[PDB]
Design a binder for this molecule. Structure first.
Ligand SMILES: [Zn+2]
Lengths: 101, 335, 17, 67, 146, 138
């Protein structure tokens, strides 16, 4: 039950969601860029981008603004699910080509 | 345009993906597996114990670069962390030698060791499951012989050079059975650690633990993991005569060839091409060629330091990306 | 080569400490 | 002083190449470029690590204080 | 620092964009800069810390693709969302201003992006140069905001 | 129909990229309006333009035939104007100037790509309003 990993920044959050900034510690461009790509691949997402506010801190601030269909949290959760699925496809294809060789 | 990075004489164009809904009125390219699953493809070109070369085809730059970054900085490997000097009478300083020993890459497979917990006491931090203990005991003495005066030091002295292979695996606790079939040796045993003259000696032990390339370079498992986009050369109009041979000279040897009979220059192998855009400076081929790179065709080259195979390193990187996405997914979002 | 080393071995380093 | 173990840039292990590069230059004498390429030093950073190294340890060892 | 953005000797701004900031601004607002929605929002997230709401304007180019110019990026930099009170109006001659082809044309018809028109925090022409983001000029963007 | 503030055919006089690689400033005069000139900045890597080609230029508001405040694209199945125009820009009219007796010039900025439309009687239609779609087809 990790309660420190991902936080919701309330000052950056709208009413009823659909626009929220998340703070993700121990994260950098690696997860930020893949997550942003996958999240932009969602029709309801109108805005996605991350930022590492300072190199000294291992912190990532990812901003999601959606249209009214879904909330930023839902778009985030969908982005994480889709990133997992994509990496699973990559794993299967790569292990198959390794086995074939 | 349209998936092709444009290689111009003074700039690079069309470098962003543009494969999302909201690029155009047709809100196409929504994410879905079973479209990415059927379009994505892997073509392995070569496999060694220390190098791999494969093509991730039809994948986005963010994911390919995520794998590359994970391999370089986040895949764990084992390297010496603490060096205890019983005796060091060589000219090489203790910390210099310790840093060099840290840079020696060990042929111990990770997942044989557990991560060290640094919250524990110093007396209780290193175990037979956390640490590899390597010793090094070298004493340099004059060779009891008489070759040509002032010859190479390999026969004027004994132990005149200290190699990485002189680092000895010392099983602790139950490692005597765990590591019996895979004794810990340097990945590169001819690494020159120190040179010493008669009367000089280096006695030490080194504790080797799991680490992360982001924490220190010595932990990185890849001597370089990177990719490159697939070069694409499009000969717009036929090139013939000596002009075709000059066009051929504009590229590395095998990249393009001259057809026999037609005497026209055709692209023979664009993979072998380095994009020096030499052809783009002659104003003779200005409109007869278009240089480009396929933006979603990545030619990965993963050369491993030696502790694990390059395909294993890449698979571990994909698994690391998936694991961090899943960890975030499971984590609750706190106000 | 051509070996699925990752399936054969149960990884431990890769999990977060 | 003594040859670095790793290329500063790529991280490739170049510390096991110094003696063999010296041997390729001295015995079966070759050009520096061909000797470097025969050792697998293709990247120019790796080539630099060997081509520009000054082996000061051999001079420093002439002043051995424990003769 | 905020109380001393101007020098007292002339009233001209002295705290303003320096070299690489000026060049980056120029390269963003350069007339050849176009951005799709993904790149635009990543730029806006870089501009903020990821903690600022942005009202995305309609794209400058709606067909064949949805593309935003760099001047729209800088308009969002000046005034991100409708809650931002900063509504800026400004005319400025860039440090390299070649005139229009005709002596009767307005200055924003410069053959280059030599003239900055800003209306309601919207940059309607001209690149972001030193003369409009740097020191010594009272037609600076930051000077007018101040 | 009732949303086209202006439409006319123009004959391109010249196209010049002045130190640009994707934006060209084209100049055109109206076919069958002896006074209507046009200076226009076109992204030519999207819409290639050659000297002496005839372009149908239309100015419209509301391409159509929550309080989110972020622009949302119309759906892919939405019938709208621009379904028969090759190139479409969105910008604002920011200046009307007088150039002579019964001859005015109107200035549109499409994110920095300027349009200068010289004409005679386009007053009851061309307003200083954000709603300005420029539509162009070959
Ligand atoms: Zn190197």
């Amino acid at each position: 039950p990790d309660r420190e990993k991902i936080k919701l920044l309330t000052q950056a959050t709208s009413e009823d969601g659909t626009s929220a900034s998340f703070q993700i510690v121990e994260e950098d461009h690696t997860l930020g860029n893949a997550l942003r790509y996958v999240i932009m691949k969602n029709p309801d997402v109108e805005f996605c981008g991350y930022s590492i506010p300072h190199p000294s801190e291992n912190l990532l601030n990812i901003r999601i603004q959606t249209y009214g269909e879904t909330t930023a949290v839902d778009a985030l959760q969908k982005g994480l699910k889709d990133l997992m699925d994509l990496c699973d496809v990559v794993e299967s294809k790569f292990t198959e080509k390794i086995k074939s060789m | 345009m349209s998936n092709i990075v444009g290689i111009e004489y003074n700039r690079v164009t069309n470098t962003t993906s543009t494969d999302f809904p909201g690029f155009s009125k047709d809100a196409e390219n929504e994410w879905n597996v079973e479209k990415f699953k059927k379009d994505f493809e892997v073509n392995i070109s070569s496999l060694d114990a220390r190098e791999a070369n494969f093509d991730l085809i039809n994948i986005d730059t963010s994911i390919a670069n995520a794998f590359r970054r994970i391999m370089i900085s986040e895949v764990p490997s084992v390297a010496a962390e603490y060096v205890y000097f019983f005796n060091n009478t060589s000219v090489i300083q203790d910390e210099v030698l310790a840093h060099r020993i840290g840079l020696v890459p060990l042929k111990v497979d990770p997942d044989m060791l557990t991560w060290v917990d640094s919250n524990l006491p110093d007396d209780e931090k290193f175990t037979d499951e956390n640490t590899i203990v390597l010793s090094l005991n070298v004493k340099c003495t004059r060779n009891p012989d008489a070759p040509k005066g002032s010859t190479d030091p390999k026969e004027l002295y004994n132990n005149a050079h200290v190699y990485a292979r002189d680092l000895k695996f010392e099983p602790q606790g139950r490692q005597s059975t765990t590591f019996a079939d895979c004794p810990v040796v340097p990945a590169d045993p001819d690494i020159l650690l120190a040179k010493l003259r008669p009367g000089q000696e280096i006695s030490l032990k080194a504790h080797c633990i799991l680490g992360i390339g982001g924490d220190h370079a010595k932990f990185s498992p890849v001597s370089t993991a990177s990719y490159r986009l697939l070069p694409q050369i499009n000969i717009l109009q036929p090139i013939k005569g000596e002009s075709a041979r000059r066009f051929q000279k504009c590229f590395p040897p095998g990249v393009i060839g001259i057809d026999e009979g037609s005497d026209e220059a055709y692209v023979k192998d664009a993979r072998k091409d380095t994009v020096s855009r030499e052809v783009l400076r002659y104003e003779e081929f200005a409109d007869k060629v278009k240089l480009g790179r396929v933006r979603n065709h990545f030619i990965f080259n993963v050369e491993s330091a030696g502790a694990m195979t390059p395909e294993e390193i890449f698979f571990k990187s994909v698994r690391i990306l998936k694991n961090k996405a899943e960890y975030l997914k499971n984590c609750p979002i706190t106000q | 080569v051509s070996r699925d080393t990752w399936n054969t071995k149960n990884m431990r380093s890769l999990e977060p400490p | 002083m003594i040859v670095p173990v790793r290329c500063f840039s790529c991280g490739k292990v170049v510390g096991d190449k110094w003696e063999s590069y010296l041997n390729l230059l001295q015995e079966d004498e070759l050009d520096e470029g061909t000797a470097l390429s025969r050792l697998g030093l293709k990247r120019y950073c790796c080539r630099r690590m060997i081509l520009t190294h000054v082996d000061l340890i051999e001079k420093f060892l002439r002043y051995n204080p424990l003769e | 620092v905020k109380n001393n953005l101007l020098t007292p000797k002339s009233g001209e701004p002295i705290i303003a964009a320096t070299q690489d900031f000026i060049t980056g601004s120029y390269l963003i607002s350069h007339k050849d800069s176009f951005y799709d929605r993904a790149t635009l929002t990543q730029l806006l997230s870089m501009m903020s810390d990821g903690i600022e709401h942005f009202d995305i304007p309609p794209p400058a180019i709606m067909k064949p693709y949805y593309l935003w110019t760099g001047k729209q990026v800088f308009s969002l930099l000046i005034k991100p969302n409708h809650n931002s009170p900063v509504v800026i109006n400004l005319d400025a001659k860039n440090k390299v201003f070649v005139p229009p082809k005709s002596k009767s044309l307005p200055n924003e018809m410069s053959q280059n992006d030599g003239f900055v028109i800003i209306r309601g925090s919207q940059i309607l022409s001209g690149v972001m140069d030193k003369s409009v983001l740097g020191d010594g000029k009272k037609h600076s963007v930051f000077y007018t905001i101040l | 129909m009732s949303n086209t503030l202006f439409d006319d055919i123009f004959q391109v006089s010249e196209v010049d990229p002045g130190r640009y690689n994707k934006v060209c400033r084209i100049e055109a005069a109206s076919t069958t309006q002896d006074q209507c000139k046009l200076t226009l900045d076109i992204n030519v890597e999207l819409f290639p333009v050659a000297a002496q080609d005839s372009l149908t230029v239309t100015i419209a508001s509301s391409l159509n035939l929550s309080a989110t405040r972020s622009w949302r694209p119309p759906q892919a199945g939405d019938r709208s104007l621009a379904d028969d125009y090759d190139y479409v820009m969105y910008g604002t009219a920011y200046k009307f100037e007088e150039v002579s007796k019964d001859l005015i010039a109107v200035y549109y900025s499409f994110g920095g790509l300027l349009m200068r439309l010289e004409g005679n009687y386009r007053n009851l239609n061309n307003l200083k309003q954000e709603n300005a779609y420029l539509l162009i087809r070959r």
